[PDB]
């Protein structure tokens, strides 16, 4: 029943405008936090901005301070990033996603095409399996983070997914052959049983500090 719909995106000059619009349903939206999360072709996730419930409070990452302004319609339960000044940079499938840091619920997301903190380590960047494999993936951190890391899947041309949350509890209606584990640095996401609908790329992100940094992925192909 929840519903992020965007739209906005699209082919735009250098120094060009955008305004992306993501319609929210199926919930109370000002009862949350939002965020705007942009992740380059064929790179991993980056935080782009957060807006908090009420509206009041800004967040924003440092490449796209000054340029880019998040903003919400209570009302109508919409949110809204205005971006000016386009870089090549920018060119991203940006994606609301709900929640300060969990990020429970992501948006198909819209195509832009324009034409110090803690890192996060996965391995392996890519592998091969069959169904029923035994898969183990690993998240090291340059910092401890403690519990704050969440598991995310991503199949191709869709949105992330919420796995796992705080390490190791497993987010609700999620199967159980997903297991998260790791309690400072190093994190292991487990699918006792690979079925076909895995084969995607996994991600790994942190909350500990600001901003929250994204794991470079885990390709789990056939």
């Known amino acids: 029943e929840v519903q992020l719909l965007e739209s906005g995106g699209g082919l735009v000059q250098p120094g060009g405008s955008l305004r992306l619009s993501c319609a929210a349903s199926?919930?109370?939206?000002?009862?949350?936090?939002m965020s705007w999360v942009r992740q380059a072709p064929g790179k991993g996730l980056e935080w782009v901005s957060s807006?908090?419930?009420?509206?009041?409070?800004?967040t924003y990452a440092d490449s796209v301070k000054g340029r880019f302004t998040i903003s919400r319609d209570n009302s109508k339960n919409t949110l809204y990033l205005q971006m000016n000044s386009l870089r090549a940079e920018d060119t991203a499938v940006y994606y609301c996603?709900?929640?300060?840091?969990?990020?429970?619920?992501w948006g198909q997301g819209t195509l832009v095409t324009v034409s110090t903190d803690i890192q996060m380590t996965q391995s392996p960047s890519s592998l091969s399996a069959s169904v029923g494999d035994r898969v183990t993936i690993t998240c090291r951190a340059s910092?401890?983070?403690?519990?704050?890391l969440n598991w995310y899947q991503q199949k191709p041309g869709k949105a992330p997914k919420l796995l796992i949350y705080?390490?190791?509890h497993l987010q609700s209606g999620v199967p159980s052959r997903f297991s998260g584990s790791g309690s400072g640095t190093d994190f292991t996401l487990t699918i006792s049983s690979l079925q076909p609908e895995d084969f995607a790329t996994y991600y790994c992100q942190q909350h500990r500090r600001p901003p929250p940094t994204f794991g470079q992925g885990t390709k789990v192909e056939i």
């Open positions: 199926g919930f109370t939206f000002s009862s949350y936090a």
């Open positions: 807006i908090s419930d009420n509206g009041q409070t800004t």
């Open positions: 705080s390490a190791s």
């Open positions: 910092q401890s983070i403690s519990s704050y």
């Open positions: 996603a709900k929640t300060p840091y969990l990020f429970d619920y």
